[PDB]
Design a protein around this ligand. Structure first.
Ligand SMILES: Cc1noc(-c2ccc(Cl)cc2NC(=O)C2=C(C(=O)O)CCC2)n1
Length: 134
């Protein structure tokens, strides 16, 4: 019933690359980076009508956002930034832009084979986090 269907489900982190550097660029402090980098979240994605919900559950923090595509919302990130976020679908990729303090970071989620690939960019730095079905 919608192309956003290939994201729905329960996903578990299986690989991370460059995440510490991404977090440094975002401005996350040492202790949060270390504990955050250890986390192995599950990502739970659901759809109800026009509302998409993404939950991240881990030993560090449980976070949840709900949103409508293209409609800005205020978000508290896991590292406690208060950001203005918009999430859109662009050619089959979920594109999440977070703005705060004159900065911006973009998080892209895409289906590739049986994985959900998360690419996180802050200025020159890209982190790639790969999830598989739980
Ligand atoms: C920045 C930043 N500072 O702390 C954190 C973070 C902290 C804890 C936990 Cl448990 C996960 C985190 N972040 C993630 O997992 C992220 C992605 C993911 O969903 O893979 C996409 C980008 C961030 N992110």
């Amino acid at each position: 019933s919608h192309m956003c269907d290939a994201f729905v489900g329960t996903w578990k982190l299986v690989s991370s690359e460059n995440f510490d550097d991404y977090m440094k660029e975002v401005g996350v402090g040492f202790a949060t980076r270390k504990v955050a980098g250890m986390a192995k979240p599950n990502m739970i994605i659901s759809v109800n009508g026009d509302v998409i919900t993404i939950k991240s559950e881990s030993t560090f923090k449980n976070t949840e956002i709900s949103f409508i595509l293209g409609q800005e919302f205020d978000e508290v990130t896991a590292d406690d930034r208060k950001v203005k976020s918009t999430i859109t679908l662009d050619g089959g990729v979920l594109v999440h832009v977070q703005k705060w303090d004159g900065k911006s970071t973009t998080i892209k989620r895409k289906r590739e084979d049986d994985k959900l690939v998360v690419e996180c960019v802050m200025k020159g730095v890209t982190s790639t986090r790969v999830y598989e079905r739980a």
